[PDB]
Amino acid sequence: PAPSANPAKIFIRRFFSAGVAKNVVSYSNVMAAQRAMEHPVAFRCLDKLGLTVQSVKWDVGKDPQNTQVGDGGMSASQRKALQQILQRPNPTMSGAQLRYSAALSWACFGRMAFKVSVMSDGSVNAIWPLGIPFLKQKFDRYGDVESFQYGDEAGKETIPSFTKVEKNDKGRPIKNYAFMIVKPSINGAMNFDVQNTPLQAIGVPVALYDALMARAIDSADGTPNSKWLVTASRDLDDGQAKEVKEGIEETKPGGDNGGEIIFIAGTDVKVQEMKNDLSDIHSKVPLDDQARTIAGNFGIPIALLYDESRKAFFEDTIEPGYLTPLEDGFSMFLCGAGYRVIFDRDSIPALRKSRADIAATYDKVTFITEEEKREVTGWPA
Amino acid sequence: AAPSRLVQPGCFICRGVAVS
C-alpha cells in the first residue's frame, strides 16, 4: 500500500531545499508567454488550441477497463454532484471557459492547476482555475509537494496537496486541495524539472519575425514614393525653371494640360524614372519559413492557416496532447476507480463522418458479437 | 589555516588551601 517511499528523494538532499515555496515557472517563461499573446502568429495558434478543446463536451461515466468490481463511485451522489460541477463550475463560469483556460495554460507553461472545495462527504462544491505564473508550491521531505502558495503577502492560503489532506474512510478528501498537473520531461524530476513547452524552442523565429516585420513597417514610411527625378543644368534662369516644372507637373489626372506631351525647346532636360520596387519589404521568403516553424512547433498542419488535414490536427495533436492529459489528470484525483471523466468523441463535428463510415463497415462483419461491435466505436452498453 | 594550539585544562583541584 502507499509506498510513501519514492525514489524522488534524490533531489531534496542538496539539489533542492525543503520548505522554500519555490515558484513553478521561471519569470523568463512568464514574460515569454505574455509577449507571445500579442504576436500575430503565436496568438493565432494559441487561441486555436484553446478554442478547439473548448468545443468538447464533458460527462462522467463508467470506465471501459472496469476490472474494479468494488466500484469507486463511492456514493453515486458524489458522482451526480461531480457531473453538475463539470457542466457548471463556480458561479460566473462555465465548463467551456474552464476547458479553455486549462488547455491554454497547458500550452504556454505545460502545467494545469485547479482548486476544489468538497463540502464534507466527497461531494465536490466548486472548481477554480489557478494562475500558473504566480503559483508557488512547497515540497515535502521525501519526494513530493505538500502545499501550494497562492499570493505574495496578503493571500497566503497554504492549500494542501491531494496527497496530504483529510480523507474520508473511503479515500476521498473532505477539505480543499489542488492538482498541479505536470508535463514530464528528460531526467525524470517529476516536479523538480524544467517545463516542457513549445515556447522553449520558438524563441529565435519569433525574434526574427518581429525584426523583419519591424523593418517592413519602417521602410513603408521613410522611402520616397515619388518617381521621375528630373534634373536641369545651371543655365536655366530660375523663373523659367519654375514654368518647366509647372509644365511637367501640370500633367496629373485632372490638370490643365493633362495627358499631353511635354515639349522643351532648347536646354535639354534629363529625366530618369526611379523603380521603387517596395514589393519585398517584409522578406516574403524568410517570413513564411518562420511562420511555418512557430505553427509546426505548436503541432499545426500548415494547411489550416484540406479536410484530411483537419482530421489530422484533431486526432494527432489535439486529442493525445490536450485531451488525454487533461482527462487522466482529472480521472486520477477527482473520483474513485470504476468511474472517470469522459468526453464524447462524436461531439467533434469533423470526425462525425469518420465515425459514420467506421460504424457502417463494422456493421457488415459477422464473426463478431454485438457488444464488441459497439465498444470498438464508443457505445458502452 | 595556521596551526592553532589545543590548550586543555590541567590538573585543577583547589581554590582554598595554598601549598606551603
Binding site: 523568463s28 505574495d152 | 590548550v7 585544562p9 585543577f12
Partner: protein, 288 residues
C-alpha cells in the same frame, strides 16, 4: 567543459534558540498585557477583644505593551546572465535571504540593542549574573572554571520556578567533558574514550553562536591562556516564561516594478517579528 552538478557551499548555521522561548502570535503591530507587581500584605495578626481591623496595603497591577519590528532587504540582477545561465539565481537568492533572515532574527533576539531591534536578554542585563572564583597556580591568581562550579550553578536554580534548561557552547561542553582529576582520570565518562550523555535528559540544549568563552577553543588556561575574566559562560532559565517571541507575518518577496530600469530587475523581501523579556527573575547567567 564537463560542468558537474556539484554545488559545494560549506557554510553553517547556529543551533536555534527559538523552540525554547515562549512563542506567541499577534496580528496587529502593537500588543498589550497586564502584570502583577506584588500582591501586597492584607491583614495582620491582630489582638483579641478589639472591635476594629486594619486596611493593610493593596497590591499593584501594571499594564505593559510592546511593538513588533520589521526586517527588510532588496536585491537585483541583470536579466542577461539570468537568461543565459545554467542555474537559478532567483531560488539561490531566495534561499540566501531566508538564511540571512533566520540568522539575523536569532542574533537579534539574543543580543538585540534597544531601538528597532528586540532587546536581547544578553544586553538586558537583568538576568542575575553569578561570577565564578579564580584559582591559584604557582602563586598566580589566574581565573578558571570547574565542573564543581558548573554543578553548583546548575543546582542553585530555585526549585519552585520549575524545570529550567541550560544553554552553552560545544566548546564549553568539550572543556567540561575533558576534565581530569588529580591523578589522571576523567571526571565524566571514566575509560570510554568519549563522554556523550543524553543532552535532552540532562536538560542542556547546545548552540554555537554564544560568546564562547574559550576563544577558538584555545583558552584552557594555565599561563597566558586564562579565560580573560568577564566572559559569558552559560545561561540557565525557565525559557517558557522568561523570554517571549511574537510573530506577525512570515517572509514575503515582491518584484519592484518601477526602479527596474529594464537592465537590473529587482526584488524586495520583508518580514515582521519581535521579542521581549517578561519576568527576568527566572533566569541566571554563569560567568567567569
Amino acid at each position: 567543459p564537463q560542468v558537474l552538478a556539484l554545488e559545494v557551499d560549506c557554510n553553517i548555521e547556529c543551533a536555534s534558540l527559538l523552540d525554547l522561548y515562549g512563542q506567541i502570535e499577534v496580528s496587529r503591530s502593537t500588543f498589550t498585557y497586564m502584570k502583577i507587581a506584588d500582591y501586597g500584605q492584607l491583614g495582620e495578626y491582630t489582638c483579641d477583644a478589639k472591635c476594629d481591623a486594619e486596611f493593610g496595603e493593596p497590591g499593584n497591577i501594571r499594564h505593559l505593551e510592546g511593538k513588533t519590528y520589521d526586517y527588510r532587504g532588496v536585491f537585483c540582477f541583470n536579466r542577461k546572465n539570468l537568461q543565459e545561465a545554467n542555474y537559478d539565481f532567483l531560488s539561490f537568492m531566495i534561499g540566501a535571504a531566508q538564511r540571512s533572515h533566520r540568522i539575523n532574527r536569532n542574533q537579534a533576539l539574543m543580543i538585540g540593542k534597544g531601538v528597532n531591534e528586540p532587546k536581547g536578554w544578553l544586553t538586558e542585563n537583568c538576568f542575575p549574573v553569578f561570577q565564578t572564583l579564580p584559582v591559584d597556580v604557582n602563586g598566580t591568581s589566574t581565573p578558571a572554571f570547574l565542573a564543581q562550579d558548573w554543578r553548583r550553578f546548575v543546582t542553585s536554580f530555585p526549585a519552585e520556578y520549575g524545570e529550567a534548561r541550560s544553554v552553552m557552547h560545544q566548546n564549553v561542553f568539550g572543556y567540561l567533558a575533558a576534565m581530569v582529576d588529580a591523578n589522571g582520570r576523567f571526571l565524566f565518562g571514566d575509560g570510554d574514550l568519549t563522554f556523550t550523555p543524553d543532552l535532552v535528559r540532562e536538560r542542556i540544549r547546545i548552540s554555537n553562536c554564544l560568546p564562547d568563552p574559550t576563544e577558538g577553543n584555545t583558552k584552557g588556561g594555565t599561563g597566558q591562556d586564562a579565560f580573560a575574566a568577564g566572559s559569558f559562560v552559560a545561561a540557565q532559565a525557565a525559557w517558557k516564561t522568561a523570554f517571549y517571541a511574537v510573530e506577525k507575518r512570515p517572509m514575503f518577496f515582491e518584484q519592484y516594478e518601477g526602479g527596474s530600469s529594464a537592465w537590473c530587475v529587482k526584488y524586495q523581501f520583508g518580514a515582521e517579528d519581535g521579542g521581549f523579556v517578561g519576568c527576568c527573575e527566572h533566569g541566571r547567567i554563569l560567568q567567569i
